[PDB]
């Protein structure tokens, strides 16, 4: 069932299925379903039109996919523009939170590039 | 209804047991009931010390120090008993704490 523009899985429980939308975790799904009054284990292929619409309305109040990506990109570019140390690390693609780089920085650096 | 409670601490169990024996013998001599001496569980602290000056992590010495304790109660004491305890000598290496 399309929610927030996404085809969330239809054979899984609601609490799991809602997590396929960007920006919605276990906590957020449990709160959305608690608000609209649906059991977490209810399967998505068992929800009527009104039930789906209520979840859509609640999920609207939380920033999910495009707004969230836009906000993240803007925050990163603002740091890369101000000229702070964090922006300088973002520019060179290096750890931002004080981790060592003599070894073990592969998530940020990529596969090891030969000399 | 006053029961005297003496607590003995030391690093040496032979010395502590000698002092406890002296105390109980004096109490019985002047005439009084005594409970104990009652042994208390010992404290053990352990230390690891590098033996080489510069570098050998496995070359080490392991030391320990133990504190032993004893509890003695003098029940229904006589007037002379209290003065006898004060008259008793002081032994190096044994701490005595008497509560009335």
């Amino acid at each position: 069932a399309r929610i927030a523009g996404v085809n969330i899985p239809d054979n899984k429980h609601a609490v799991i299925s809602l997590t396929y939308i960007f920006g919605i975790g276990r906590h957020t799904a449990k709160n959305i379903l608690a608000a609209v009054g649906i059991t977490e284990t209810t399967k998505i292929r068992e929800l009527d039109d009104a039930q789906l619409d209520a979840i859509r309305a609640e999920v609207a109040k939380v920033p999910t996919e495009g707004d969230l990506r836009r906000e993240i990109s803007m925050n990163i570019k603002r740091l890369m523009d101000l000229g702070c140390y964090r922006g300088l690390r973002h520019r060179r693609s290096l750890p931002v939170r004080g981790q060592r780089t003599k070894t073990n920085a592969r998530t940020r650096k990529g596969p090891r590039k030969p000399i | 209804n006053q029961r005297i409670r003496i607590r003995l601490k030391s690093f040496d169990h032979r010395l502590i047991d000698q002092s406890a024996q002296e105390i109980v013998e004096t109490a019985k001599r002047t005439g009084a009931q005594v409970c104990g001496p009652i042994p208390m569980p010992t404290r053990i602290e352990r230390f690891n010390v590098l033996t080489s000056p510069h570098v050998n992590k496995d070359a080490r010495d392991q030391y320990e120090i133990r504190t032993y304790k004893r509890l003695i109660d003098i029940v229904q004491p006589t007037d002379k008993t209290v003065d006898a305890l004060m008259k008793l000598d002081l032994a190096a290496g044994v701490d005595v704490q008497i509560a009335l």
Partner: protein, 82 residues
């Protein structure tokens, strides 16, 4: 970060210098070694030369710099590639 109940941290000797500079119309930079002081809204528009270990680097404070420490704008190491 620093707890909110304590508030922000600013060195007294730098705070007095900024007080004087803002109260008057001085254009001369403010020369400082205090890289741990926070940038307050009163800093905006001023110029502070911040120590980096060997040199004082000019910094022109904009609104977007408020809430950062002075030293976040003076890198202390030199790297150019292997």
């Amino acid at each position: 970060p620093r707890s909110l109940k304590k508030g922000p941290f600013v060195d007294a000797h730098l705070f007095a210098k900024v007080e004087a500079a803002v109260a008057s119309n001085s254009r001369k930079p403010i020369k400082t070694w205090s890289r741990r002081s926070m940038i307050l809204p009163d800093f905006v528009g001023l110029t502070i030369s911040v120590h980096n270990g060997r040199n004082h680097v000019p910094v022109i404070v904009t609104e977007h710099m408020v809430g950062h420490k002075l030293g976040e704008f003076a890198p202390t190491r030199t790297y150019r590639g292997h």
